[PDB]
Nucleic acid binder design. Structure first.
Lengths: 49, 49, 49, 49, 300, 49
DNA sequence: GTATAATGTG
């Protein structure tokens, strides 16, 4: 619940960055201009976030 | 490379890797070659030859 | 081009640091710090920490 | 910027080219990541407007 | 600093090529490509000719590498002119290098035309395509980018000729573009404002600070939604059990999916006409008394 | 003036006239920017004379 | 997809 005995920091490794992430960003497109909605594998895709 | 390490004062990468800051920045931004590893054992056994 | 392998870029640093062993250089630097040479002793102490 | 540089690196590797251009673009990706993690920590900061 | 200068030294390491050198390098690269085609086509692989073919392939690879290294100068000299348009010079240089590779992979020497002429068109096309496809964060389609560029060119021409900013009607008359289309193109062509720019000029807050949400407020939906759900459990429960199921299915309380009179009739066996009378009776029952009094507040 | 000289160095010298040479956009843009955003162009407080 | 020519910056 709210039992936080300690808080530590470390140096992330390739594997740690991937484990935190739910999906990989393949393309730079941010939004579709016509539908005003996120694009596939973009910087806002629902598939990723 | 992480910017915080090779550019910070002290540069942690420079300290751990026993390299001068100028050499580290030259290597990082593709300025000059560096000898990573050499077959020193074969060099020694073949010093005569 | 048969014994020494050299390259330029962050990949070279990654390979060199992976090959580099912390324990051996740590022992060597502990031995060095066991000596004097005050001029070099400050740099040796920083690298040792 | 980082995504575009990475995709261009992948495209260059796929097609293949003399190492000069590939090394230049690798430096480009490194500098782009550097700018991402911190602007002004090294070199000229980026400014659009 | 000066990321460009290291690349300048690298490109200037190699020397130029002359017409005879260009012709000989073209012949060598053609020979290498033909050798590779033979390698993938020489079903009756020779023994020594195979080693000679491999050597010729390596020679052709070296020749093409040298050709590209020498030609990078033209790429730089062409990309020079597209700076200051939302893309760093270095990115344009890389795009031009890609265009130069594309030109080289299709070069022909028989026509006798110089390679620089052939490569310039490809480099320019690649640079402009990359700028169109990457300059804008909200990446517009290439055709719309071309239309925007045309509109801007017409606008600047009219401003120069008339000495003043042309009106929408005058711009449409000159360009023949619809006024609505002109407005759409002008609104789609605009630099966005970065939410991190300071507002008020004292840096007491950046613009991103003052932007509201568009979701359920602490009270707007939460309290009213939960309260009307409880009042639903109180009122819609008053409806008869058969009528409660009728609402739950045809209208969609429990399982949603409002079951059209035909669908709920299939479930219950009743017809489309009989259910209407019961529905109207339920309407009459609800609109009178405490039920309507409770439900008025949620209709306004 | 920068743009004017750049244009005149390239445009044809035969049928050139000053009308087609002078560009009025930058000067009016600068005047408007100063009168709008400059810190020395403040609203005239009108509590009383 | 291109055919005069076009070969190193702010």
């Amino acid at each position: 619940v709210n039992f936080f005995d300690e808080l530590r920091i470390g140096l992330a490794t390739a594997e740690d960055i991937r484990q935190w992430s739910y999906g990989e960003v393949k393309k730079p497109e941010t939004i579709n201009y016509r539908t005003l909605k996120p694009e596939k594998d973009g910087l806002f895709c629902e598939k990723i976030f | 490379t992480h910017i915080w390490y090779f550019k910070g004062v002290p540069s942690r990468l420079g300290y751990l890797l026993d390299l001068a800051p100028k050499d580290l920045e030259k290597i990082i931004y593709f300025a000059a070659y560096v000898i990573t590893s050499v077959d020193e054992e074969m060099r020694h056994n073949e010093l005569s030859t | 081009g048969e014994y020494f392998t050299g390259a330029m870029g962050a990949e070279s640093i990654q390979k060199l640091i992976e090959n580099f062993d912390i324990d051996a250089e740590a022992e060597s630097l502990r031995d060095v710090i066991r000596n004097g040479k005050g001029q070099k002793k400050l740099r040796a102490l920083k690298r040792l920490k | 910027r980082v995504i575009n540089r990475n995709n261009r690196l992948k495209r260059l590797i796929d097609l293949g080219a003399p190492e000069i251009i590939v090394n230049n673009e690798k430096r480009m990706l490194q500098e782009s990541v550097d700018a991402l993690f911190d602007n002004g920590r090294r070199g000229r900061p980026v400014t659009g407007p | 600093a000066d990321l460009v200068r290291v690349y300048l030294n690298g490109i200037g390491k190699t020397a130029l090529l002359n017409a005879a050198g260009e012709v000989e390098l073209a012949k060598r690269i053609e020979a290498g490509l033909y050798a590779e085609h033979l390698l993938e086509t020489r079903k009756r692989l020779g023994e020594n000719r195979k080693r000679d073919l491999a050597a010729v392939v390596r020679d052709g690879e070296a020749a093409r590498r040298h050709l590209l290294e020498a030609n990078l100068r033209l790429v730089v000299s062409l990309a020079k002119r597209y700076t200051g348009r939302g893309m760093p010079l270095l990115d344009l240089i890389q795009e031009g290098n890609l265009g130069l590779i594309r030109a080289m992979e299709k070069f022909d020497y028989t026509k006798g035309f110089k390679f620089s002429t052939y490569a310039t068109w490809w480099i320019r096309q690649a640079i402009t395509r990359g700028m169109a496809d990457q300059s804008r964060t909200i990446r517009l389609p290439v055709h719309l980018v071309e239309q925007v560029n045309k509109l801007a060119r017409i606008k600047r021409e009219m401003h120069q000729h008339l000495g003043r900013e042309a009106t929408d009607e005058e711009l449409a008359a000159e360009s023949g573009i619809p006024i609505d289309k002109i407005n759409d193109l002008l609104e789609h062509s605009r630099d966005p404002v970065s939410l991190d720019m300071p507002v008020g000029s004292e840096e007491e807050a950046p613009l991103g600070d003052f932007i509201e949400d568009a979701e359920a407020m602490s009270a707007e939906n939460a309290v009213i939604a939960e309260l009307l759900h409880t009042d639903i459990r109180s009122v819609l429960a008053t409806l008869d059990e058969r009528e409660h199921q009728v609402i739950r299915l045809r209208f969609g309380l429990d399982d949603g999916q409002p079951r059209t009179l035909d669908q709920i009739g299939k479930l219950f066996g009743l017809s489309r006409e009989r259910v209407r009378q019961i529905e109207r009776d339920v309407m009459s029952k609800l609109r009178h008394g405490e039920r309507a009094d409770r439900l008025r507040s949620y209709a306004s | 003036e920068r743009v004017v000289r750049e244009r005149m160095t390239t445009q044809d010298v035969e049928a050139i006239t000053p009308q087609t040479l002078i560009n009025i956009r930058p000067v009016v843009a600068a005047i408007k920017e100063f009168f709008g955003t400059s810190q020395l162009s403040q609203f005239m407080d009108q509590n009383n004379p």
